[PDB]
């Protein structure tokens, strides 16, 4: 068994885990977003776009 | 492959006059070289050494003796072997006969070596060698040393240069045994094994057997019999093997290993085979075959 | 199986003797076009020589032959 390939990509799972709405659904996710804002990150979440 | 040769300080502080006069009176007072030997048949002194021969290996063949046993016979050929140079005890430090064999054209030889043959008055040989000989065995320059120098039943010591095989490992060069083919041995089936013995020796010995380019080595086969001599065609028929490939020249001599000084009652002509009636002999022309001698030996099938 | 110290500039130069190339003692030069090559090799226009003017071969007359062209 060769390791190293733990990242199996999937857009549904990526948006459903680290998206905006699961971050906003819980209070501590909202303080995660708030300290992302206080640090000054250009990308707030993995699914943000314009 | 030489040491740094000579500092050679030139200034002698004017003692050079004494050394130059000493050298002039030293060369002029040395004895005149002894006359040309001019050899006819001579007596057999027991402690007397004979010359050798440069013979060419021509391959191996099959013959059966009158008793009915097959003998492995190699055949050698004497390629116009002559005496080219001579060394003796008064003018040189030793007493030797210089032999030449084969032939080469003038354009195929170096000018430094062709000059030696042109001064000697002999044809251009392809191989030059020498043998230590006794005082009564000095045969003059230009004398042929053919197959008739040797006799049937004589034992000779043939010297040859082995076949080239290239670089080989210790399995066939030194005959070492390796490691088993299938018992867990990892990549070491033809390894030499242990070479040193740890910190206490701390080094590999100066005579260690390790893989190398074996081949072209001067190996001598001692005490081999002579089964047949063809004097007209210069062929000698040794029994057994001769080191070297076919076409390479080998050296022959009377066997000093079997040396009781009697030469085992072999009928050896001492200076060489001094030929009587050298006239009436043809040059390379429409000649034919001649007669040969052979030894017999007793009781090859004495019992079962 | 590993160097124990660092090789010096003198020792490195001595070790690198096998890497050097021997100079060639002969060259075949075309007098016209100034080309240079070995004496056993064609170096005219059929081989690589963009400077060839054909003067390298000074005579080539062969008009007569007769055969069946297979068509």
């Amino acid at each position: 068994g060769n390791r190293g390939n733990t990242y199996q990509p999937s857009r549904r799972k990526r948006v459903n885990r680290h998206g905006l709405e699961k971050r906003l659904s819980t209070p501590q996710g909202r303080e995660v977003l708030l300290r992302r804002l206080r640090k000054g990150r250009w990308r707030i979440t993995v699914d943000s776009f314009r | 492959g030489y040491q740094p040769p000579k500092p050679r300080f030139p200034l002698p502080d004017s003692i050079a006059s004494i050394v130059e006069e000493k050298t002039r009176e030293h060369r002029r007072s040395a004895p005149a070289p002894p006359p040309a030997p001019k050899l006819e048949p001579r007596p057999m002194t027991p402690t007397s050494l004979r010359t050798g021969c440069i013979a060419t290996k021509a391959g191996m063949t099959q013959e059966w003796d009158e008793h009915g046993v097959r003998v492995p016979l190699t055949v050698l050929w004497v390629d116009e072997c002559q005496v080219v140079g001579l060394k003796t005890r008064p003018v040189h430090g030793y007493n030797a006969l210089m032999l030449g064999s084969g032939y080469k054209r003038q354009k195929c030889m170096s000018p430094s070596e062709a000059g030696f043959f042109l001064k000697a008055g002999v044809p251009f040989k392809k191989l030059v060698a020498e043998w230590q000989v006794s005082e009564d065995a000095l045969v003059p320059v230009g004398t042929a040393i053919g197959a008739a120098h040797y006799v049937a039943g004589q034992r000779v010591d043939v010297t040859g240069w082995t076949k080239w095989k290239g670089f080989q490992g210790v399995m066939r060069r030194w005959g070492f045994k390796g490691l088993p083919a299938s018992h867990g041995v990892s990549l070491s089936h033809r390894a030499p094994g242990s070479i040193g013995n740890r910190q206490d020796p701390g080094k590999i010995w100066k005579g260690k057997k390790l893989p190398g380019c074996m081949g072209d080595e001067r190996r001598t086969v001692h005490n081999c019999l002579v089964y047949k001599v063809d004097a007209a065609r210069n062929l000698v028929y040794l029994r057994g093997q001769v080191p070297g490939p076919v076409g390479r020249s080998v050296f022959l001599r009377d066997s000093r290993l079997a040396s009781p000084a009697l030469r085992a009652s072999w009928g050896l002509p001492f200076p060489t085979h001094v030929p009587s009636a050298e006239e009436l002999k043809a040059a390379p022309a429409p000649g034919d075959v001649s007669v040969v001698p052979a030894p017999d030996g007793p009781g090859v099938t004495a019992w079962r | 199986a590993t160097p124990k110290k660092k090789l010096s500039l003198h020792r490195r130069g001595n070790r690198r003797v096998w890497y050097w190339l021997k100079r060639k003692t002969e060259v075949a030069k075309c007098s016209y076009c100034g080309a240079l090559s070995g004496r056993n090799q064609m170096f005219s226009g059929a081989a690589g020589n963009s400077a060839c003017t054909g003067q390298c071969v000074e005579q080539a007359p062969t008009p007569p032959a007769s055969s069946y062209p297979a068509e």
Binding site: - | - | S37, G38, N40, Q41, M42, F43, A46, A47, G48, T62, A65, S67, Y68, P69, A70
Partner: protein, 177 residues
């Protein structure tokens, strides 16, 4: 590991033997289609030996020779050329139908390169030598070839006058059956 050069045998050319024979068949077909091809020295020497074997097989002109060449030689446009133009061209030549001229090294791998071409053709690079050399009957060679059993072996036209008196006959035509 078997010794091929140094013990006269075929080159290996870095290939398995079936690939090697197929590559030589392709190259001999290419050599007779375009009469001068350029390749590396080892393939060039192997091509020269194979060309001598194939050209002699075409020179026999027999049905078994045609059958053997049919598998050896691929094109079929050039099987005709080998059996007709090449056979008539070298009908009296005792071997040596091909010359080799070295041409330097190639850019991709610095391999030595040789030009291999058929001799005795319009467009060759050196004048050929005649395959036969008519003998003077007043010289030593002719008398050695009379005392010893040697044929005359003179240069000849394609149909000599020794068949002219048979072919002139109107009763030896059979009308073409």
């Amino acid at each position: 590991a078997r010794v091929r050069v140094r013990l006269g045998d075929w080159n290996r050319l870095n290939r398995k033997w079936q690939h090697r024979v197929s590559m030589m068949k392709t190259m001999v077909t290419q050599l007779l289609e375009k009469e001068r091809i350029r390749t590396t020295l080892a393939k060039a020497k192997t091509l020269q030996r194979y060309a001598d074997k194939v050209i002699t097989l075409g020179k026999q002109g027999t049905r078994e020779a045609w059958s053997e060449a049919r598998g050896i030689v691929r094109t079929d446009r050039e099987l005709h050329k080998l059996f007709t133009q090449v056979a008539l061209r070298y009908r009296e030549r005792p071997g040596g139908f091909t010359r080799l001229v070295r041409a330097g090294w190639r850019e991709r791998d610095a391999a030595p390169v040789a030009f291999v071409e058929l001799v005795d053709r319009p467009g060759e690079l050196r004048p050929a030598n005649p395959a036969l050399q008519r003998p003077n009957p007043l010289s030593v060679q002719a008398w050695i070839r009379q005392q010893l059993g040697q044929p005359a072996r003179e240069p000849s036209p394609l149909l000599p006058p020794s068949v002219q008196q048979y072919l002139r006959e109107e009763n030896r035509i059979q009308q073409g059956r």
